[PDB]
RNA sequence: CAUCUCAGUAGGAGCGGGAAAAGAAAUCAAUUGAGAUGCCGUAAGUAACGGCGAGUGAAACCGGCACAGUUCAAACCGAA
RNA sequence: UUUACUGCAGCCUGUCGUUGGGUUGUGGUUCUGGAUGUACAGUGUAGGUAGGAGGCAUCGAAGCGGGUGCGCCAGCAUUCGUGGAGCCGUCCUUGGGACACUACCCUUCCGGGACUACGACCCUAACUCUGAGAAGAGGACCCCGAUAGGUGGGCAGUUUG
């Protein structure tokens, strides 16, 4: 399915309907300095590592389309609950 | 400055591989390797180290060089059921340090004496060498000596085996006070060995 | 059930006395204070850890018992 | 039992320590002899950006040999010499930079002298094996300690609703 790249909607921050550009959200790299990373490094030793030797699970048949809406006026972005589609495109 | 020659011995042994001790080390480990486990010596190798650790030139004070192997606790793989955590032993070093191992071997070799202290005197890729000072509580010189006659007491016997030397206290975790010594003083066994 | 728990338990080896160990801060505090160690009460199932699950789990302050301080290495002398 | 899950031994391999001395090959470490700098033409080589101008000279300033720095067999430094006036520019050779012998750290210059990480070879002197020893054979390798990855039902604990 297609969603427009830019459309007029409500900005929660400036509290008005302005034009907003839609951007697909890319998952970031997990920090190596997080508390879970430090706990993993601390619990690594000889033997089973507990939950840190878990293999990542499976996948749902379709993933949600992670979208982020940036107000064109205040340049702040908000992200809303998103739909779930096999094929996603931007209308231009 | 007016420094004692003990100060020069200290400076020479501060960075031994950058001083003449490195060459001396080269000739000297050749002789030490041919020797056995526990060798009595006439004089300490590092006189200033011995004197600061308590060595005196008097009757009843013996100095020995002990040879100890390198690496951790050479441990046997269990042959019965274990947890995965308790199955691996190769990476498990001990809780007994090499210096205290040398002290205890010297104490075993010399049943009538008591270990006072010991210091590092060399090492190679396979061995470390320590010099252990021992005291004779039943020698009249030591009995007269009021800075050593505490060793004639019933509680001063078995010091190295009961962990009462400086290396033993360091291994017991009583080298410091305050935070981190909650489970170490007054003894490891007093808190179910949860410290260390 | 694997980390965890059971648990530094059971068991082992060494040493050892009527007690043993610890013991006179390179400490604990917090705006400025206290003043060796040990043991008891409390802090407190708190902080902390933990498939943050099950569980595990302090210390300081403070109130008590009892109170105790010192000896070397070196500087100076040089067998005194 | 295994190409079930998770581990642990053994083994293979990198790195560090053990572990030293020489020869060269590789990077810059560090600096002497030149500031070597030049679309257009130049009396003249931006003599680094410069007090936007101002010091030397027969007790030294050039048209030359394979031109000692360099390069367009020009020209600056006067050196092996012999020839007998290079100025600075307010006539700036209508300026990629326009130029006073004024403490050159800077794209070069190849004494690169000195330490360095990798690789190749040699030495013995550590270290190893043999021998009672003289000594013989290896040799900074191997073994060994640590660490990193692999392989690993040899072994352990479980699961298999």
From Swiss-Prot, chain B:
InterPro entries membership: Rbsml_eL15_core_dom_sf, Ribosomal_eL15, Ribosomal_eL15_arc, Ribosomal_eL15_CS, Ribosomal_uL23/eL15/eS24_sf
GO MF entry, a single one: structural constituent of ribosome
Keyword Ribosomal protein set for record: yes
One Pfam entry name: Ribosomal_L15e
UniProt biased composition (Basic residues): 159-172
Any one cellular-component term (Gene Ontology): cytosolic large ribosomal subunit
Keywords, alphabetical: Ribonucleoprotein, Ribosomal protein
Keyword Ribonucleoprotein listed: yes
Segments for region (Disordered): 153-196
GO biological process: cytoplasmic translation
Name of protein: Large ribosomal subunit protein eL15
Gene name of this polypeptide: rpl15e
